[PDB]
Design an enzyme around this catalytic site. Structure first.
Site, PDB file in Angstrom:
ATOM      1  N   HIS B  87       0.849  -1.185   0.000  1.00  0.00           N
ATOM      2  CA  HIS B  87       0.000   0.000   0.000  1.00  0.00           C
ATOM      3  C   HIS B  87       0.890   1.242   0.000  1.00  0.00           C
ATOM      4  CE1 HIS B  87      -3.540  -2.427   0.807  1.00  0.00           C
ATOM      5  NE2 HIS B  87      -2.813  -3.109   1.709  1.00  0.00           N
ATOM      6  N   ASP B  90      -1.367   8.762  -1.629  1.00  0.00           N
ATOM      7  CA  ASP B  90      -1.337   9.943  -2.495  1.00  0.00           C
ATOM      8  C   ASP B  90      -2.270  10.979  -1.867  1.00  0.00           C
ATOM      9  OD1 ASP B  90      -2.118  11.871  -4.715  1.00  0.00           O
ATOM     10  OD2 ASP B  90      -2.397  10.170  -6.143  1.00  0.00           O
ATOM     11  N   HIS B  92      -3.960  14.484  -2.554  1.00  0.00           N
ATOM     12  CA  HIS B  92      -4.216  15.498  -3.566  1.00  0.00           C
ATOM     13  C   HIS B  92      -3.891  16.912  -3.077  1.00  0.00           C
ATOM     14  CE1 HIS B  92      -7.388  13.125  -6.125  1.00  0.00           C
ATOM     15  NE2 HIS B  92      -6.266  12.415  -6.019  1.00  0.00           N
ATOM     16  N   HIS B 127      -5.707   8.981  -1.125  1.00  0.00           N
ATOM     17  CA  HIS B 127      -6.052   7.600  -1.480  1.00  0.00           C
ATOM     18  C   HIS B 127      -4.791   6.782  -1.723  1.00  0.00           C
ATOM     19  CE1 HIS B 127      -5.349   7.973  -5.846  1.00  0.00           C
ATOM     20  NE2 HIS B 127      -5.919   9.164  -5.768  1.00  0.00           N
ATOM     21  N   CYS B 128      -4.938   5.466  -1.614  1.00  0.00           N
ATOM     22  CA  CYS B 128      -3.885   4.521  -1.975  1.00  0.00           C
ATOM     23  C   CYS B 128      -3.765   4.497  -3.494  1.00  0.00           C
ATOM     24  CB  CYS B 128      -4.234   3.157  -1.376  1.00  0.00           C
ATOM     25  SG  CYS B 128      -2.929   1.914  -1.591  1.00  0.00           S
ATOM     26  N   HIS B 138      -7.495  -0.627  -5.231  1.00  0.00           N
ATOM     27  CA  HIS B 138      -7.345  -0.262  -3.825  1.00  0.00           C
ATOM     28  C   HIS B 138      -8.329   0.838  -3.453  1.00  0.00           C
ATOM     29  CE1 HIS B 138      -3.477  -2.376  -2.516  1.00  0.00           C
ATOM     30  NE2 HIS B 138      -3.802  -2.882  -3.694  1.00  0.00           N
ATOM     31  N   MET B 143      -9.828   2.409   0.095  1.00  0.00           N
ATOM     32  CA  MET B 143      -8.639   3.104   0.584  1.00  0.00           C
ATOM     33  C   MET B 143      -8.602   4.547   0.080  1.00  0.00           C
ATOM     34  SD  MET B 143      -5.565   0.332   0.841  1.00  0.00           S
ATOM     35  CE  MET B 143      -4.718   1.396   2.013  1.00  0.00           C
ATOM     36  N   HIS B 248     -27.208  16.507  -2.003  1.00  0.00           N
ATOM     37  CA  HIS B 248     -28.414  17.272  -1.784  1.00  0.00           C
ATOM     38  C   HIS B 248     -28.919  17.013  -0.364  1.00  0.00           C
ATOM     39  CE1 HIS B 248     -32.297  19.075  -2.891  1.00  0.00           C
ATOM     40  NE2 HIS B 248     -32.796  18.282  -2.045  1.00  0.00           N
ATOM     41  N   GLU B 272     -29.390  24.018  -4.446  1.00  0.00           N
ATOM     42  CA  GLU B 272     -30.238  22.870  -4.131  1.00  0.00           C
ATOM     43  C   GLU B 272     -29.411  21.591  -4.100  1.00  0.00           C
ATOM     44  OE1 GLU B 272     -33.399  21.856  -7.208  1.00  0.00           O
ATOM     45  OE2 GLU B 272     -32.211  23.193  -8.534  1.00  0.00           O
ATOM     46  N   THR B 273     -28.561  21.420  -5.104  1.00  0.00           N
ATOM     47  CA  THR B 273     -27.775  20.220  -5.320  1.00  0.00           C
ATOM     48  C   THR B 273     -26.439  20.685  -5.854  1.00  0.00           C
ATOM     49  OG1 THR B 273     -29.760  18.962  -5.786  1.00  0.00           O
ATOM     50  CG2 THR B 273     -27.709  18.065  -6.663  1.00  0.00           C
ATOM     51  N   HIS B 299     -28.156  12.875  -5.403  1.00  0.00           N
ATOM     52  CA  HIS B 299     -29.451  13.016  -6.062  1.00  0.00           C
ATOM     53  C   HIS B 299     -29.559  12.312  -7.411  1.00  0.00           C
ATOM     54  CE1 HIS B 299     -33.501  14.594  -6.578  1.00  0.00           C
ATOM     55  NE2 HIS B 299     -33.453  15.169  -5.406  1.00  0.00           N
TER      56      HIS B 299
HETATM   57  O1  NO2 Z   1       0.056  -3.964  -4.992  1.00  0.00           O
HETATM   58  N1  NO2 Z   1      -1.104  -3.900  -4.536  1.00  0.00           N
HETATM   59  O2  NO2 Z   1      -1.992  -4.848  -4.587  1.00  0.00           O
HETATM   60  O1  NO2 Z   2     -35.506  16.307  -2.485  1.00  0.00           O
HETATM   61  N1  NO2 Z   2     -34.910  15.222  -2.499  1.00  0.00           N
HETATM   62  O2  NO2 Z   2     -34.896  14.162  -3.184  1.00  0.00           O
HETATM   63  O1  NO2 Z   3      -3.951  11.220  -7.327  1.00  0.00           O
HETATM   64  N1  NO2 Z   3      -4.305  10.560  -8.313  1.00  0.00           N
HETATM   65  O2  NO2 Z   3      -4.997   9.535  -8.562  1.00  0.00           O
HETATM   66 CU    CU Z   4      -3.730   0.039  -0.811  1.00  0.00          CU
HETATM   67 CU    CU Z   5     -35.069  15.904  -4.364  1.00  0.00          CU
HETATM   68 CU    CU Z   6      -5.850  10.762  -7.072  1.00  0.00          CU
END
Ligand code: NO2
Ligand code: NO2
Ligand code: NO2
Ligand code: CU
Ligand code: CU
Ligand code: CU
Ligand SMILES: OC[C@H]1O[C@@](CO)(O[C@H]2O[C@H](CO)[C@@H](O)[C@H](O)[C@H]2O)[C@@H](O)[C@@H]1O
Ligand SMILES: OC[C@H]1O[C@@](CO)(O[C@H]2O[C@H](CO)[C@@H](O)[C@H](O)[C@H]2O)[C@@H](O)[C@@H]1O
Ligand SMILES: OC[C@H]1O[C@@](CO)(O[C@H]2O[C@H](CO)[C@@H](O)[C@H](O)[C@H]2O)[C@@H](O)[C@@H]1O
Ligand SMILES: OC[C@H]1O[C@@](CO)(O[C@H]2O[C@H](CO)[C@@H](O)[C@H](O)[C@H]2O)[C@@H](O)[C@@H]1O
Ligand SMILES: OC[C@H]1O[C@@](CO)(O[C@H]2O[C@H](CO)[C@@H](O)[C@H](O)[C@H]2O)[C@@H](O)[C@@H]1O
Ligand SMILES: OC[C@H]1O[C@@](CO)(O[C@H]2O[C@H](CO)[C@@H](O)[C@H](O)[C@H]2O)[C@@H](O)[C@@H]1O
Ligand SMILES: OC[C@H]1O[C@@](CO)(O[C@H]2O[C@H](CO)[C@@H](O)[C@H](O)[C@H]2O)[C@@H](O)[C@@H]1O
Ligand SMILES: OC[C@H]1O[C@@](CO)(O[C@H]2O[C@H](CO)[C@@H](O)[C@H](O)[C@H]2O)[C@@H](O)[C@@H]1O
Ligand SMILES: OC[C@H]1O[C@@](CO)(O[C@H]2O[C@H](CO)[C@@H](O)[C@H](O)[C@H]2O)[C@@H](O)[C@@H]1O
Ligand SMILES: OC[C@H]1O[C@@](CO)(O[C@H]2O[C@H](CO)[C@@H](O)[C@H](O)[C@H]2O)[C@@H](O)[C@@H]1O
Ligand SMILES: OC[C@H]1O[C@@](CO)(O[C@H]2O[C@H](CO)[C@@H](O)[C@H](O)[C@H]2O)[C@@H](O)[C@@H]1O
Ligand SMILES: OC[C@H]1O[C@@](CO)(O[C@H]2O[C@H](CO)[C@@H](O)[C@H](O)[C@H]2O)[C@@H](O)[C@@H]1O
Ligand code: NO2
Ligand code: NO2
Ligand code: NO2
Ligand code: NO2
Ligand code: NO2
Ligand code: NO2
Ligand code: CU
Ligand code: CU
Ligand code: CU
Lengths: 338, 338, 338
Positions: B87, B90, B92, B127-128, B138, B143, B248, B272-273, B299
């Site tokens: 593992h 990363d 961002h 994330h991994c 992963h 992950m 939402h 709203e969304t 939504h």
């Molecule tokens: O190398 N990761 O499964």
């Molecule tokens: O307003 N919600 O689905």
């Molecule tokens: O951060 N990149 O998948």
């Molecule tokens: Cu991993």
């Molecule tokens: Cu709705």
């Molecule tokens: Cu990424």
């Protein structure tokens, strides 16, 4: 207790919109609307495929409601005894009680009256939401529309200038999930209830069989193209209650676009394609500059051309050769060409 | 060489967030975090379906890390010898070396220490990403988490006004791809490795079997609903490391929304969304105005109701009949109605 | 009638871009471009799978055209007699006649000359659109590219500051829909026409078999990685004519991003991941701060790693340990650890 003038609005079928003022000097009112649920078999494509729809006011989408910021909206929702299912309504414009859904569940033979204050400007989805798996099912069976809450001074460009539309159209986009038999033919049913189990299986795979404007493939093409004239500023409200869309006016642009749909935010300018998040409405203003046919699509072109999601505008006026011209018509490639 | 105070942070399981300051007068620190990889079978839906998950700190999502602009983040990543796979991590939020992935690959039985400077404000995915096809695998096995880098003056509305939240929740959304047998039943496996080939086949068709918050359908409903009170400003951080989402709050709005998740940009108002791009985090502030149950969804309502992607808020306080009221409870449709 | 200087531009194959000025003091010109349609079988993945492509200028994407606001763009579109299908061109940058499609339909053996005025700034898609179901088919067979219309003063940050790029790359992303036989193997055909019926069936299910940059899996990896240097400001133009994408530079950010792609709108700052709506182009500026390999992906990581949608940048320069450092290399977990 609430002592304001009342005004009854008569709704009209999409893509048209009931009469309203943009800017207004009227104070807040209680704006009264009625929506009547209708379950019915409807034709959804150009080959005649039907499905067991569920609607507000007999249309997909439901009609556009238009009010102003600070109005109260008093909605009578009616569920006729000829219907088979309970229904309700959730307004994304409203605050509390699941948008109203928690206060509006009605069985066939009943009606209910909800009031909500229009505190938030923009275009918003409304939709049925009876609970649990019935929420997506009622929505993708057609039970969704939109409401527009205008500022009392009308629209603006976010930079202190008023914007006014000459025409408004409401394009409701609907993703449909029609069951197929083993050979691929669409199945028919005698009631929404009978269609449910097979429909839910299609829904689960998240791939619509149809994506349509105004309730069917070809609804807004041909003799039902949308009219405009060169020079007119047209507001195009677009909603999608369940699934993303990417509107595009072929041959045009979005001069001012509120893709998230909320007028407290300045619009973006000069877009080619915009994005309606599933569960929302957005709006685009465009001033036509050229006559002719325009296609209005979601710009997944597979959806647009092959699943139903194309509308037309027919625009009258004079062609502007400065903006575009055919310098030379199709001709044989010169023999001298390398 | 780097001579700054060090501060150890104890992480907490989502949807809760470790204690932190919004605005701070402290200068930059080295903020020390530890993440421990745990591969384990987990229950993901209300029918008891399991799958071979891979996690940071035993949770899906991984925990939210909170620091301020200009802090350094020193992360010890541990891969216990009871695990089967390599593992890495990363961020961002970080600059260089594939977000850290190129400096953090560890086999079972190893640990590594990465430091990155928090130069960019916002909420961000971590994330991994071990390499090649193992990256999506992963991630969609669980992950992924998020980190928030606050401005030292806390949040603002982009128009010179401070914004402060009374509560913060982190909603990690996970798309899952669980294999099925020929009859449609979900398959079980004895290890992640054994599950891989069948899982990859599902992944390739890009349609999740489940879309869940906090690691399972129903995780944040019932007794695990999220609490709030009328009048409180609540920050809802939402991440999706692999696939788009459209949050939402049913019955509410996003008062201030950073849908791209980055605090150098002014928020949008009154949504709203909103839209979380796959591979990102975003955030929404909402001040509750009404008591009761709220559903928080993506939504796409099929995903929300039928694939697992619904959370609840339970909000205490007094109902405001000015914002919404049931004018007339359900009643038989008048015989006089036309 | 139109009495302006003419300037012939020689296009270059993506991801490179023909030479141009950013800021210019030249007045409007008629900028002359030629596009030649080529139908040909092309290799699209690292296993050698082919498909019956249709291209502008022999490339997927078609080449990037660069002009300035107020220029006129005079395009000669050529359809050689060795082709089998009619073709045309729609410029999302242009006003009228379906973007030009209604004025440019040419059979094999013909050419046509269209002029459009560059009234709208930004990056825009161009694509073939012969009519009906042929529109999506030609587009997803490869017939799409982009045009950039710069302001005459070049780019700016929306806050009165000039932005200048040291390098520009154009990443065209293509969703492909390659038929499979009953065992899952990709099918081959002798002509586009023969491939159509099977391809349309795949298209209808809206799930690509491949998602590629510059026309094939691995096109911009290995020896064809994109070059840059620490300190250089790089503009990355990204287009997708049919389907959404979510670009992300692994180890980097978008310093200034126009995700809707239109330079009349201020860019967003400091993004992790951005969003290209299907049917549009967008652009991101990034100043590299660290050397090494960067992956540029759509951040649906399944698509990125398993369907083809990864490019690399190779960045030369010196590593900055202040921004990121490996404090301790992988080591056995202390026996004392709890
Ligand atoms: O190398 N990761 O499964
Ligand atoms: O307003 N919600 O689905
Ligand atoms: O951060 N990149 O998948
Ligand atoms: Cu991993
Ligand atoms: Cu709705
Ligand atoms: Cu990424
Ligand atoms: O015989 C099937 C054939 O008839 C059409 C007629 O327009 O529609 C029928 O069958 C459809 C598919 O089951 C139904 O949706 C419809 O209700 C019924 O009239 C054709 O569409 C169909 O191919
Ligand atoms: O914003 C429109 C409308 O929303 C209300 C709530 O009904 O205020 C919300 O938005 C305000 C401005 O962003 C916040 O300051 C406020 O806390 C939040 O409730 C109305 O007061 C306002 O007119
Ligand atoms: O789509 C699968 C397969 O089904 C058939 C009928 O067996 O056509 C059906 O599907 C088409 C695509 O949605 C529709 O145009 C048509 O209305 C429907 O019956 C086959 O023709 C198609 O190959
Ligand atoms: O409005 C489009 C319509 O007008 C006609 C003339 O009646 O042609 C005009 O529009 C064309 C572009 O679509 C121009 O090339 C032409 O010069 C202009 O006269 C029709 O041919 C066309 O359908
Ligand atoms: O007998 C299958 C039946 O048992 C349940 C019990 O909750 O779960 C088992 O089977 C699932 C499907 O293979 C596995 O995911 C799970 O690990 C196992 O306990 C039901 O979900 C399932 O239908
Ligand atoms: O923007 C936050 C942070 O990013 C840095 C790089 O670590 O600067 C980037 O963004 C600047 C403002 O947009 C650009 O001017 C600069 O060129 C770019 O590297 C930091 O300097 C800045 O605080
Ligand atoms: O979904 C296909 C088909 O599979 C069955 C079992 O044969 O149910 C499975 O799929 C359902 C939908 O995902 C799950 O609710 C259930 O846990 C799973 O076993 C059928 O019931 C269904 O028709
Ligand atoms: O907080 C919601 C909860 O409060 C109760 C009273 O205890 O009713 C309030 O909320 C309703 C809207 O959901 C209002 O219509 C009602 O007037 C108000 O008292 C409960 O019924 C409800 O669950
Ligand atoms: O024998 C099939 C085997 O050959 C390869 C060679 O690279 O490609 C052939 O078959 C592909 C699948 O039909 C075609 O796309 C291609 O045109 C043809 O050369 C392998 O990809 C394939 O598995
Ligand atoms: O906006 C760029 C360019 O668009 C034109 C039309 O060719 O104007 C459009 O946009 C204007 C500014 O938003 C609107 O005021 C106008 O009504 C609309 O046609 C050009 O005039 C302008 O330079
Ligand atoms: O994907 C289904 C199934 O098809 C096979 C060949 O029978 O592989 C094909 O599909 C793979 C995934 O797209 C490709 O990598 C390969 O080029 C293609 O032939 C099986 O291996 C796979 O299980
Ligand atoms: O440019 C990346 C490349 O540079 C080397 C040294 O030649 O290492 C540098 O980059 C590493 C991060 O990727 C740093 O950890 C290291 O301190 C720095 O010297 C190569 O190992 C690496 O591939
Ligand atoms: O024909 N519809 O069930
Ligand atoms: O309860 N609605 O089907
Ligand atoms: O330009 N429209 O597909
Ligand atoms: O039960 N999971 O493999
Ligand atoms: O090999 N392509 O048809
Ligand atoms: O007409 N185009 O295939
Ligand atoms: Cu209903
Ligand atoms: Cu073509
Ligand atoms: Cu187009």
């Amino acid at each position: 207790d609430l002592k304001l003038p009342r005004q009854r609005v008569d709704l009209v079928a999409p893509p048209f919109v009931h009469v309203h003022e943009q800017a207004t000097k009227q104070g807040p009112k209680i704006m009264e609307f009625k929506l009547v649920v209708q379950e019915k078999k409807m034709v959804i494509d150009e080959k005649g495929t039907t499905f067991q729809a569920m609607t507000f006011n007999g249309s997909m989408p439901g009609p556009l409601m238009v009010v102003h910021e600070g109005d109260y909206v008093e909605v009578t929702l009616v569920n006729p005894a000829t219907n088979t299912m309970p229904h309700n309504i959730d307004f994304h414009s409203a605050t509390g009680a699941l948008g109203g859904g928690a206060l509006t569940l009605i069985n066939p033979g009943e009606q209910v009256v909800l009031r909500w204050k229009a505190t938030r400007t923009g275009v918003f989805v409304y939709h049925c939401a009876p609970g649990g798996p019935m929420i997506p099912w009622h929505v993708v069976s057609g039970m969704n529309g939109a409401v527009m809450v205008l500022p009392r001074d009308g629209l603006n460009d976010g930079h202190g200038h008023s914007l006014r539309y000459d025409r408004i159209y409401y394009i409701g986009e609907q993703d449909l999930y029609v069951p197929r038999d083993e050979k691929g033919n669409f199945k028919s049913y005698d009631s929404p209830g009978e269609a449910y189990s097979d429909t839910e299986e299609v829904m689960r795979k998240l791939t619509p069989t149809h994506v349509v404007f105004n309730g069917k493939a070809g609804a807004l093409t041909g003799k039902n193209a949308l009219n405009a004239n060169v020079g007119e500023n047209v507001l195009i409200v677009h909603s999608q209650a369940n699934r993303d869309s990417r509107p595009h006016l072929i041959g045009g642009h979005g001069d001012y676009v509120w893709e998230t749909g909320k007028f407290s935010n300045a619009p973006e300018t000069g877009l080619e394609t915009w994005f309606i998040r599933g569960g929302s409405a957005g709006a685009a203003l465009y001033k036509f500059l050229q006559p002719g046919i325009y296609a209005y699509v979601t710009h997944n072109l597979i959806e647009a051309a092959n699943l139903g999601a194309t509308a037309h505008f027919k625009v009258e006026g004079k062609w502007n050769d400065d903006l575009m011209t055919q310098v030379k018509a199709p001709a044989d490639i010169p023999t001298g060409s390398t």
